[PDB]
Amino acid sequence: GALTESQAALVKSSWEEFNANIPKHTHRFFILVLEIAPAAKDLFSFLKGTSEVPQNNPELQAHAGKVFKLVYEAAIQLEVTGVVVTDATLKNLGSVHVSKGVADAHFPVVKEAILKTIKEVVGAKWSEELNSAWTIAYDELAIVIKKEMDDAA
Ligand code: HEM
Ligand SMILES: O=C(O)c1cccnc1
Fold first, then answer.
1. What atom in ligand 1 is closest to the CA of residue 46?
2. What is the CATH number of the domain that holds 28?
């Protein structure tokens, strides 16, 4: 697909849709995560000692938002420029993932959790062309973070 002018137009449009509801889309996101992999719970400070995923924990929202922003930004960057640019941020990310005891087999957990979250976010407007466009953008960004973790470990 590549990211045509037509495909990027599709990712931007769908990200704008996600931001429109951070406490929902981010709590869903942690549930999709614990559905796919339960043990992941012990990883997160704000999830430990708890029995369910807190719905209004600011720490938790701030946390999940930041993750989706990072995947959008990556898609536009692909259409316009043709690539994903690795900065300070992407590298610090790689450090903290290792402190917290996170591995690569964890990544398809958080991907499916994000494609499923966006399919849920865009509903009937969903196209093969759009799925293809976020898939392309996650893959391309994960390729970069995994790359930095392996560097932070
Ligand atoms: C392209 C995919 C990913 C992106 C964009 C991303 C982004 C981030 C960011 C931005 C932070 C720090 C948040 C803060 O300062 O507020 C963080 C922390 C963390 N990440 Fe991820 N991440 C990704 C994949 C993963 C995966 C696959 C896992 C494993 C399940 C994971 C587990 C964690 C943990 C345990 C922390 C520490 C949270 C705490 O303070 O207790 N991440 N990540
Ligand atoms: O909340 C976090 O810090 C988080 C969630 C998913 C992936 N990475 C980090």
1. 41
2. 1.10.490.10
